Ligand binder design. Sequence first.
Ligand SMILES: C=C[C@@H]1C[C@]1(NC(=O)[C@@H]1C[C@@H](Oc2ncc(OC)c3ccc(Cl)cc23)CN1C(=O)[C@@H](NC(=O)OC(C)(C)C)C(C)(C)C)C(=O)NS(=O)(=O)C1CC1
Ligand SMILES: [Zn+2]
Length: 194
Amino acid sequence: KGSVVIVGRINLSGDTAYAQQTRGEEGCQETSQTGRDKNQVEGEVQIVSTATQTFLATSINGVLWTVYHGAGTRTIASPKGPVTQMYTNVDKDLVGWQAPQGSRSLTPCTCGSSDLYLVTRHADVIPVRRRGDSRGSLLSPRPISYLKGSSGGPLLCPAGHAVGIFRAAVCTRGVAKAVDFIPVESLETTMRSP
Ligand SMILES: C=C[C@@H]1C[C@]1(NC(=O)[C@@H]1C[C@@H](Oc2ncc(OC)c3ccc(Cl)cc23)CN1C(=O)[C@@H](NC(=O)OC(C)(C)C)C(C)(C)C)C(=O)NS(=O)(=O)C1CC1
Ligand SMILES: [Zn+2]
């Protein structure tokens, strides 16, 4: 198992949502085997990779969360060496490490908002109608190809709180009609329990 490596970040703190790439696909492999990543971290959302796949990770409650079908059991690279996971729920498809220094956590939502926004690896923010605990409809249906590489990113309410973590797409003939996410309350349950 190599280490998960941060190769970029998305910021959600300004008047503008943007991505910024931090590591080429050559420093990634090196960082991955040694698990030592000296690069400074910033942002609420990290763009991360394993050997051939890239996806997202989201900071909430001082934990950097992502999807299990992404990270696996893997450590994540840090300035001090490889970081072992603090939380791992396979049934939930959930992984988390302690948030790296410089990673600002999103606050978990308490609004009850039904209007949501998905953040893509492209710092695109996409309108979503919450239809259940862990589902939301896309106002604009997008092709599946469009959403690939964005799992582990946040679903946000209109006040920019975290409602949950994008996990799977509900897809019909190559089109994404809706999204399934891990509710932010399941993250909190995961945090409280041995
Ligand atoms: C289009 C972009 C979507 C968000 C995306 N995620 C996916 O591809 C997910 C992965 C897999 O689901 C799950 N795996 C493991 C689990 O635990 C170990 C799960 C435990 C509970 C549940 Cl919910 C799902 C789980 C299948 N899947 C689908 O989305 C599938 N959809 C799906 O399963 O939808 C339903 C849930 C509605 C059936 C399908 C392939 C058919 C779209 C992604 O981008 N990943 S990635 O490319 O970044 C690269 C790894 C990081
Ligand atoms: Zn909210």
